[PDB]
Amino acid sequence: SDKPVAHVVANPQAEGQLQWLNRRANALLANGVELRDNQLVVPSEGLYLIYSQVLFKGQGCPSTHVLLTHTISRIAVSYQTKVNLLSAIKSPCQAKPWYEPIYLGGVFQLEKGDRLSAEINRPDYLDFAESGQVYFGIIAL
């Protein structure tokens, strides 16, 4: 004990970005995890549960189809290795509103100093109507 954990939420006031915040109520950084250049920094080696959710919302279907992506990536200290951990793609269009959440999660072996990022392609479709709809977090097992 005690286990490194983090749960960061998107800043709804940050236009055209997916900006992670830990300095708002119901968001945290604990036992060594850090938020640096919009990335979570792993404090110690071990098995981590990495999780993320983004809610996309559009107002109808415009010309052809829109692609929505959400990716979690890991940049390591050794060899500055840039690996891609979890990724998902969605085509919401096939004027009434649509809602498309993207979930990303898994158990990974991480090392001290690994920097994890949770990114999207279209921040214009990001939904911040209410709180708790878009978050990113890691839990040490």
Ligand X SMILES: c1ccc(Cn2cnc3ccccc32)cc1
Q: Give the type of residue at 46.
A: G
Chain residues binding its own copies by CB under 8 A are: 1-3, 5-7, 25-26, 28, 30, 46-47, 49, 51, 53, 55, 57, 64-65, 67, 71-74, 83-91, 94, 96-109, 127, 130-133, 135, 137, 139-141
Q: Name the segment binding ligand X (CB under 6 A); options: 21-29, 37-45, 48-56, 124-132.
A: 48-56
Interaction of residue 71 with ligand X, rule CB under 6 A: no
Interaction of residue 106 with ligand X, rule CB under 6 A: yes
CA 102, CA 93: separation in Å to the nearest integer?
15
CA dihedral 65, 101, 76, 37 (to 10 degrees): 90
User: From residue 133, how far is each of 27, 39, 53, 89, 107 by CA, in Å?
Assistant: 13, 19, 7, 18, 22
Instruction: Give min distance, CB of 71 to ligand X, in A.
Output: 13
CA 113, CA 138: separation in Å to the nearest integer?
14
Closer CB to ligand X, residue 99 or residue 103? 103
Contact footprint for ligand X (CB under 6 A): 49, 51-53, 103-106
